[PDB]
């Protein structure tokens, strides 16, 4: 009987929808329900009984779900009359079986529409041709049935087009039929939206009949929400049909609170569709008079006053609409198709700028991408409208550079919006950093399109900063606006001197500003750093007025020895250290970019640095050797080999004396003398002075040599090059050959440098690392800041004014060892291009490098091996001329590539077997692998290079190279296998195809490519490229070697009968 079963079902569903129900009871009721749905013969009458309006919404939903279930699973077990009865039943449930729009729950409408959708998917076109006419004659009855039809069409389109929850046969049938009736469907949706928006607006403001309005409105929303389910994939013919009536009504609805979000969603999905540019051309109708009128009206409501969640979500949606629209215009105009600058292109800008001046950081940051795409367009950057909107954009960008809007603070009106967009101040901090790095480039483009007004704004911001406003400053509004003004000024000036001519630059204003920054004085480290960046930015103006050269020096050198009001009482702070380092950097940049202007003052500067280094304890080693770098940078202006050589030898005489002493030799060559001289010997454990001065002197020598190899150079102009005695000769190709003045001085220190590198590599041995005391036994480790730097995890800024000094002495030691390593290999990397011939023709230099540079690679860590390859090996080989490839590059690269290959193999073996102490090392393996593969790729292929061929013509380097390349496909790295198969493997094999090939290394090779297929597999890219590679290997190596066919036989689920046919056609001519 039906009624007893219906009461039972009511009890079951009532129990299941009760959260306080017991689990045993839940499983009993659920089991009874599933069994009922599976094998009951009166499911349809029961479900129709439960879905009647007299029942609770839970029960009605359950019955409608029963109907959906019998359509979904038991439709093929039903007769024709049963199917007709169910169809007419649910159709009349649409007709008169539901409540009103405003009184019915959405889960009942969804539950009812699901049934009709499921029947449509069962048999729409062949067995139900009058379905759309039935939805039409149903919709004409009222707005309830209309909303139901909207539900049905939306869920149908989603199910067949987006999710494809159908057999592909029925899926293609229904999609084709939709494509055929798309004009009628979009006609129904557009007409419904039009007429219902009319019915709503006619009663939008009326107290007599609100339920009527809320009826039509709720349908107008529904239509929109269903339109968004079709616009993304429907042909553009219907989106623009009836003179783009859909897009114009869509833009008008942006000003209706109840409909603005849906219309903005449909506009977003309509303006984001991709494909043929000719198919995206009609989207320019959104720049029409009515469309840009309504869009501009909606954007102008972004006053930024207060945060209303509804309004703000709408503003983000519309912002995305304007962004994607701008990207569309930049895409269509660039193709030079018959598309012209829109007549209302100004209005769009005026709308877009509304989101640029908004307090919300997310809106402006979202705007930045389309701003960048706009400022580099070849047609739009020359448009007077953009050039007229650019000053206001520059002002807004100035308001963007200032770090305001923390979720915790309440300084700027942006803060509240941040509280709505970010969980904490940290997420807002990272977002702000990324958006600032993005803002720099677009801001630069704006400065390119208008340098004069940009210079006015930058300078005026500088003056305002000069005249305005833990006794020092720590990330206060003063420091934040100082940093913003500093960034803006630096970019504006650096770009202005790039776009304007030497006749167009307003010298007087610039030198006025420079004077103002020089006279400005502060005892606060951070503000002084901003000042030094400002004078460093304003320095190009001194070319026109060199008389300011001394004052500039007085501002910089003073800051080199800057200290707080207390000097020896408190430890040195990171802030003041950054002021001294920043000053030294400004001196280096100064002497490097304008050495002809500083050359007259070389006497005073040399003596000043001399007095500054008279006290070995006054300046740090980075500061000393930075000033020395500046000195040699000025000495490059002598343009005379002999004079520069004499100055360099005189300047290096103390460093050469300390470095070439018997004691320094004994300490650099021996391990025990080194570990005792450095401080790792004993645990007063808190005092690092016993050997800290020693480490400072060694670091002084290394830093000095590095700076000399890095900053010394011959004149650029050829006439000035050979006129000073630098040209030794010319290559057979005509390219000149030069000699470096520092060569004879660095070469005499080269041997002790190599000895130090040898000892440093030897230190990582486990029996050599055991020497250090337990507080120092982790001194050769990776710094926690480097760990969190590579691991991606950022840490909040330790305020540089207090708790600044690295209190861990172990951290001091780790900084020392890391700096020494990277600096030594930096010298070995720079030595090539600085002293090309004389550095590459040293006797037994390759044997020496193997003896020192690569002596204990087995124990050298990854975070030390990677900077050796990037910093030393890559410049050594990429700058070496071909005349020494046999002499230098090959003998080093052979064992290097062999070891690198093997090490990556074992380490990836450790990877495949599978808290942060081990998560970091894996990332180290990945990045080191990228660096190695990039080294081989840049070193061999351009296909091959004379170095690639030359290395290939050698036996060891060829083998190690090919083994590395092919077994690299087995790593769990897809981006690398795509580049490796296409650019690396096939040029190798093609280069070694003609000749002898090993009888089974072919099996190892093909099986390695098969390993690449097994590892990646699903990634379409390495699947296609790997399949192509293996196909070339099989078609090129099977007729010569039979061993591969067995490797094909071991493949799972391969048929031998078709394999024999493939080989049969393979043998045929």
């Amino acid at each position: 009987q039906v009624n007893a079963l219906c009461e039972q079902l009511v009890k079951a569903v009532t129990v299941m929808m009760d959260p306080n129900s017991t689990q045993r009871y839940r499983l009993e009721a659920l089991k009874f329900c599933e069994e009922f749905k599976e094998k009951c013969p009166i499911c349809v009458p029961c479900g129709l009984r439960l879905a009647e309006k007299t029942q609770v919404a839970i029960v009605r939903h359950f019955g409608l779900q029963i109907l959906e279930h019998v359509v979904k699973f038991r439709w093929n077990g039903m007769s024709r009359l049963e199917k007709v009865y169910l169809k007419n039943s649910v159709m009349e449930l649409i007709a008169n079986g539901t409540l009103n729009i405003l009184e019915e729950e959405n889960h009942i409408k969804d539950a009812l529409s699901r049934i009709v959708v499921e029947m449509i998917k069962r048999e729409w076109p062949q067995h139900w041709p009058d379905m759309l006419i039935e939805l039409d004659t149903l919709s004409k009855q009222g707005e309830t049935q209309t909303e139901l039809v909207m539900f049905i069409l939306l869920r149908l389109a989603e199910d067949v087009v987006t999710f494809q929850t159908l057999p592909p046969q029925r899926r293609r049938d229904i999609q084709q039929t939709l494509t055929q009736n798309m004009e009628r469907i979009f006609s129904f949706l557009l007409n419904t939206l039009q007429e219902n928006v009319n019915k709503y607006q006619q009663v939008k403001t009326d107290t007599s009949q609100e339920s009527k309005a809320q009826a039509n409105c709720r349908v107008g929303v529904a239509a929109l929400n269903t339109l968004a389910g079709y616009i993304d994939w429907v042909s553009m013919s219907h989106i623009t049909a009836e003179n783009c009536k859909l897009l114009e009504i869509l833009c008008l609805l942006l000003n209706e609170q109840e409909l603005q979000l849906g219309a903005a969603e449909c506009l977003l999905i309509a303006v984001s569709r991709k494909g043929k540019l000719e198919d995206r051309k009609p989207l320019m109708v959104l720049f029409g008079d009515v469309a840009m009128h309504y869009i501009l009206s909606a954007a102008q409501t972004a006053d930024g006053g207060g945060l209303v969640e509804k309004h703000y979500v709408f503003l983000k949606r519309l912002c995305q609409v304007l962004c994607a629209l701008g990207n569309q215009l930049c895409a269509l105009l660039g193709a030079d198709s018959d598309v012209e600058t829109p007549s209302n292109f100004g209005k769009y800008l005026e709308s877009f700028l509304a989101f640029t001046t908004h307090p919300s950081q997310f809106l402006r940051s979202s705007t930045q991408m389309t701003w960048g795409a706009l400022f580099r367009h070849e047609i739009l950057s020359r448009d007077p409208l953009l050039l007229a909107i650019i000053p206001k954009y520059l002002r807004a960008s100035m308001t963007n550079l200032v770090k305001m809007g923390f979720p915790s603070k309440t300084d700027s009106p942006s803060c509240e919006y941040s509280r709505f967009d970010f969980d904490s101040d940290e997420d807002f901090n990272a977002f702000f950093n990324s958006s600032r790095a993005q803002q720099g480039e677009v801001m630069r483009l704006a400065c390119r399109l208008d340098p004069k007004t940009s210079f006015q704004m930058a300078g005026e911001w500088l003056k305002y900063q000069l005249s305005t406003f833990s006794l020092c400053s720590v990330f206060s509004p003063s420091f934040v606006q100082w940093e913003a003004m500093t960034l803006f000024l630096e970019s504006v000036i650096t770009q202005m001197f790039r776009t304007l001519n030497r006749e167009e630059i307003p010298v007087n204003d610039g030198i006025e500003l420079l004077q103002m920054v020089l006279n400005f004085d502060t005892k606060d480290p951070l503000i002084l750093s901003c000042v030094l960046t400002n004078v460093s930015a304003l320095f190009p103006f001194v070319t026109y007025r060199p008389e300011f050269l001394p004052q500039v020096f007085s501002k910089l050198f003073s800051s080199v020895t800057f200290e707080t009001v207390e000097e020896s009482k408190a430890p040195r702070t990171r802030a003041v250290r950054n002021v001294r380092r920043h000053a030294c950097s400004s001196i280096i940049k100064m002497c490097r970019d304008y050495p002809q202007l500083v050359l007259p003052n070389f006497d005073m500067l040399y003596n000043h640095v001399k007095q500054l280094l008279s006290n070995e304890l006054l300046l740090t080693q980075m500061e000393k050797c930075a000033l020395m770098e500046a000195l040699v940078l000025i000495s490059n202006q002598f343009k005379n080999y002999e004079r520069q050589k004499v100055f360099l030898e005189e300047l290096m005489a103390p460093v050469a004396s300390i470095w070439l002493s018997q004691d320094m030799h004994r300490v650099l060559s021996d391990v025990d003398a080194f570990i005792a001289y450095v401080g790792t010997d004993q645990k007063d454990p808190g005092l690092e002075d016993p050997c800290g001065l020693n480490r400072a002197r060694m670091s002084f020598c290394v830093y000095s040599i590095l700076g000399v190899v890095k900053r010394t150079c011959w004149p650029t102009d050829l006439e000035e090059a050979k006129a000073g005695g630098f040209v030794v000769g010319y290559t057979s190709s005509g390219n000149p050959i030069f000699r470096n003045p520092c060569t004879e001085q660095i070469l005499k220190l080269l041997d002790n440098l190599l000895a130090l590198i040898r000892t440093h590599n030897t230190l990582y041995a486990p029996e050599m690392l055991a020497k250090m005391a337990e507080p120092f036994t982790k001194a050769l480790d990776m710094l926690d800041a480097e760990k969190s730097a590579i691991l991606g995890l950022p840490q909040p800024l330790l305020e540089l004014n207090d708790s600044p000094v690295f209190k861990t002495v172990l951290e001091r030691m780790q900084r020392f060892f890391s700096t020494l390593y990277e600096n030594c290999f930096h010298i070995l990397g720079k030595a090539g291009p600085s002293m090309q011939q004389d550095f590459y023709t040293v006797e037994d230099l390759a044997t020496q490098l193997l003896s020192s540079a690569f002596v204990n690679l087995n124990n050298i860590p990854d975070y030390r091996l990677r900077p050796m390859l990037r910093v030393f090996v890559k410049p050594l080989v990429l700058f070496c001329p071909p005349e020494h490839y046999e002499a230098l590059v090959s003998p080093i690269l052979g064992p290097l590539f062999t070891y690198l290959h093997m090490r990556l193999s074992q380490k990836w073996q450790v990877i495949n077997q599978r808290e942060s102490q081990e998560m970091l090392e894996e990332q180290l393996v990945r990045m080191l692998t990228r660096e190695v593969m990039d080294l081989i790729t840049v070193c061999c292929v351009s296909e091959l290079t004379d170095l690639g061929k030359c290395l290939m013509k050698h036996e060891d380097v060829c083998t190690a190279l090919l083994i590395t390349a092919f077994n690299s496909l087995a790593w769990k790295d897809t981006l690398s296998c795509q580049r490796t198969t296409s650019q690396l493997c096939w040029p190798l094999l093609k280069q070694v195809l003609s000749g002898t090939l090993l009888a089974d290394a072919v099996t190892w090779l093909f099986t390695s490519v098969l390993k690449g297929l097994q590892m990646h597999g699903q990634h379409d890219g390495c699947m296609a490229s790997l399949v192509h590679l293996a196909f070339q290997i099989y078609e090129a190596l099977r007729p010569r070697y039979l061993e591969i066919r067995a490797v094909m036989e071991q493949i799972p689920e391969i048929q031998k009968d078709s394999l024999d046919q493939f080989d049969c056609k393979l043998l045929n001519p």
């Binding site: 299941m16 929808m17 959260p19 659920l30 329900c33 839970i58 699901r114 999710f163 709505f420 969980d423």
Partner: protein, 170 residues
């Protein structure tokens, strides 16, 4: 216990949502996978600066054969959590399905998307491949029932959205 909120926990089968709620309730990790039959409702009380807040979490079966009244479980839901697996890309493939069925019944409710099992080494779903939460204006969190990584962040975000206080904290 001042107010209750209905939270529906959906996702593909095996994404780790029963293990998630079980870890919240009891602090126990269940290595074995036993699929949910229908739904399992559990209470989760949080103590905030605004007082105690209760979450009735309806832990939904992810598999079709073991789903009960699937969308019927979403009735009168005030917040949702769609969970996928960062080890199985198909889960992230099916996230839009769960989202559509959720939004069709529960219009304009806070929904959190969670990528579970971040603790595993081989991560098939790269973090940059996750754009759907931005596509539907949902909040995303990387979570791990075993590591407890970002344990309360979905519940905290949902609570802040429902109560309407950005400064709400546990």
């Amino acid at each position: 216990p001042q107010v209750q909120f209905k939270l529906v926990l959906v996702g593909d089968g095996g994404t780790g949502k029963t293990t998630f709620v079980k870890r919240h309730l009891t602090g126990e990790f269940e290595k074995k996978y036993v699929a949910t039959l229908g739904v399992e409702v559990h209470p989760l009380v949080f103590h905030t600066n605004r007082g105690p807040i209760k979450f009735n979490v309806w832990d939904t079966a992810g598999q079709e054969k073991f789903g009960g009244l699937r969308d019927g479980y979403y009735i009168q839901a005030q917040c949702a959590i769609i969970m996928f697996d960062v080890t199985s890309r198909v889960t992230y493939k099916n996230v839009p399905n769960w989202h559509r069925d959720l939004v069709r019944v529960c219009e304009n409710i806070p929904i959190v998307l969670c990528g579970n099992k971040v603790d595993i080494k081989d991560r098939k779903v790269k973090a940059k491949s996750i754009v759907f939460h931005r596509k539907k204006n949902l909040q995303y969190y990387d979570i791990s029932a075993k590591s407890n990584y970002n344990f309360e962040k979905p519940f905290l975000w949902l609570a802040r959205k429902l109560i309407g206080d950005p400064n709400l904290e546990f």
